[model samples]
Target: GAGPVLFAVGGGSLFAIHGDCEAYDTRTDRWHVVASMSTRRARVGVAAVGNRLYAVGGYDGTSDLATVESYDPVTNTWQPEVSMGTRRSCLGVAALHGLLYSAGGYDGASCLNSAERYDPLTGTWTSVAAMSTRRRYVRVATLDGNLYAVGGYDSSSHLATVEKYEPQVNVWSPVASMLSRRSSAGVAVLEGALYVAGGNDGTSCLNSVERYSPKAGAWESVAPMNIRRSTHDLVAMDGWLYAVGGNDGSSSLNSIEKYNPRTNKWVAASCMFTRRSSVGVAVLELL
Candidate 1:
């Protein structure tokens, strides 16, 4: 009722995989626990569409996950949604054109190049075209009427390559690669530019950042984050881009930071009480 709340869906920590969730209120600058999912998972894909939060494919510690659930912010409740065709973890998910797109990720046995979408209106998932390459820990963001599959791993190497999908054409094409090969990076679209933040670069965790502008059709360096992070989530609220919880190598992190495009600087925000890395986050209208 006060203002839009930033919700963190299930995430993993050094402690264990979690089905629980957390909420951050910008007005109070504080965090509080929310309802827990029925199934514990990590590396899950989460999206907010039409006022409901959907928790998609992930891992349950022992096996891959295809279980899906929906959360209602106003009711503070979670309900089961339709499951994906196959189990997926570390997949990229984006809500584009009012529908949810689930992109590349590793199924238990192999990395997946295939993708699918969920239509809430129909309560169904339909297959989409496969990507050129298999990807794990891929991060996807939508910009300029297209979905961009950012840097990720393919089991053998960290990848700098990216792909763009135009739903109207039913095609997936290569796009300009990121400056660095990274996996599990935080991705968000801000002010018409796509921003990709810290992730592991095979050799080490990265603190570097990059942005892609359509005008240039290329990636360029931006101010780096204060800490190296992997498996984190990034979201744009109002005008600022937030880098939420992730690992800094030694342990799970609860820290949060925001980047100011106007100032080209990164600043710290209040930390959540629960440490969470590999988290999924979204901005929901204040309800």
Candidate 2:
């Protein structure tokens, strides 16, 4: 099997939301722009189901958006799709079994605990069980046929709380919490474990990292990242974890880093062409 390529999808700077999209080639250590989305978006939830990539709810500069779009790499274009049941930004998304799940995020008014699932066959979204905690900028990961919702802000404070959902049962239950409170952190499952890296607590940005073990039902701290980052995206490709573009408290960052599990450290990689915070990233294997 060929290695997966990382696509840094829609993201934005302080001045404006962006529709621009780019892809990074790990083998070549290079980046290139791809076809732009139908709408300019930031803080969007993205997940790949088969060959099609879905971009979920986000802000479009003017208002919180409920629009959803799917990208067909084979055709190199985007097509409009059914929107989510709720209008949310800064949410977490995952693809499981044959469905797409959207978890906690912030509505225009406040942080939300609501969750929803999309059925591609029917081309519709149905509300799922809400999370126990209202959260935004959260990260979701899938493991052992389950979906795990990681840390984020609850509008009032940064959270270290974790939750798990079983799609078959359509329920969510509390699980182990992280060592550090984090919002807008990056999460990816690597080597049968869920790894979370770089986000801010209520006070400041964090470089801390941690991983959760299903066998132990707990979280343990790992090596810290080289720099502070929040609102980033994480993707695992060929056993290596990549932290994509995000914000460091003051500015949007184009920088990227790869985690070396063998060394328990992160090494800087090529920076993205566009600086972005609250960006969406998805791994697609080139045919």
Candidate 3:
């Protein structure tokens, strides 16, 4: 009935975990509370598919979670769903070809390269091809029918490497590396190009950004974010990419900004009400 609505899902401060969720209308720039998720989770994977928002694995302060939940914006309620096979946090979730994909993440003890796909029809999650590189806090984006796992830490070091998954063949392969190493970055596709922004490179937060062109088969530098950040979330709406709340190493940040590909610049937008890091952002274009 209307246009896209952006959602700020579960996140936490330094130690507190939250189950709260909020919706922001891009057309009006207004924020309102929605249904809080049943489970309190941070670093959870959230993706929207066919009017349903699925919240995947995450940590609850003490344990890595294998629990999954789905939020119905229409009903304003969250329902428990089939859990993933692995207990992981900081995983990347994406909706592609009617299925939700849960990619690489940490399992408390170590980083993992394994991935799985959820089928709504069967209400089950099946193992899929694992990523080539082990990563935690990775960012996933679907482009040209392919899913990409962007830069993240591999336990030993921050990675500039990227990988792509083909649904039809069910295979994961290496893609062009980014210009800079990043972990806990935000990634979104804008006008056919995949853009990755601010993250940590092991030592400090980064403000660097890069874009990848499928046709060109390579990544190039783009306008960096004004503020250094990591564990942030990015959503593409109405031709603009919005970077939401995240941590800047020392503390959580509530500042928000929008990127205009046309001008190749990032401008400040309305800030969020609460400070959060490892948040999940999703765009729902209601029709």
Query: Candidate 2: where are CA atoms >4 Å away?
Result: none
Task: Put down candidate 1 lDDT per residue, 151-216, tens digits, no spaces.
Answer: 788868889999999999999999998889989999999999999999999989899999999788
Q: Write the per-residue lDDT of candidate 3 for residues 143-223, one digit (tens) a residue.
A: 999999998888898999999999889999899999889999999999999999999988889988899999998888999
Pairs that collide, model 1: 4-286
What TM-scores do the predictions have?
0.97, 0.97, 0.98
What does candidate 2's lDDT look like per residue over 1-287, in tens digits?
66688888888887978898998999889998898999988999989888578999888987778889999888889999998878889999999987989998888988889999898889899999899999888888898899999988887889999999988898899988889899999999999899999988888888888999999998888888887989988899878899998888889989999998988979999888899889999999884
Candidate 1 wrong stretches, greater than 4 Å: 1-3
Cα RMSD to the true fold for all candidates: 1.2, 1.0, 1.0
Q: What do the candidate models score in CA lDDT, each in turn?
A: 0.90, 0.89, 0.90
* Residue 158, candidate 2: alpha-carbon lDDT: 90
lDDT of 3 at 215: 97
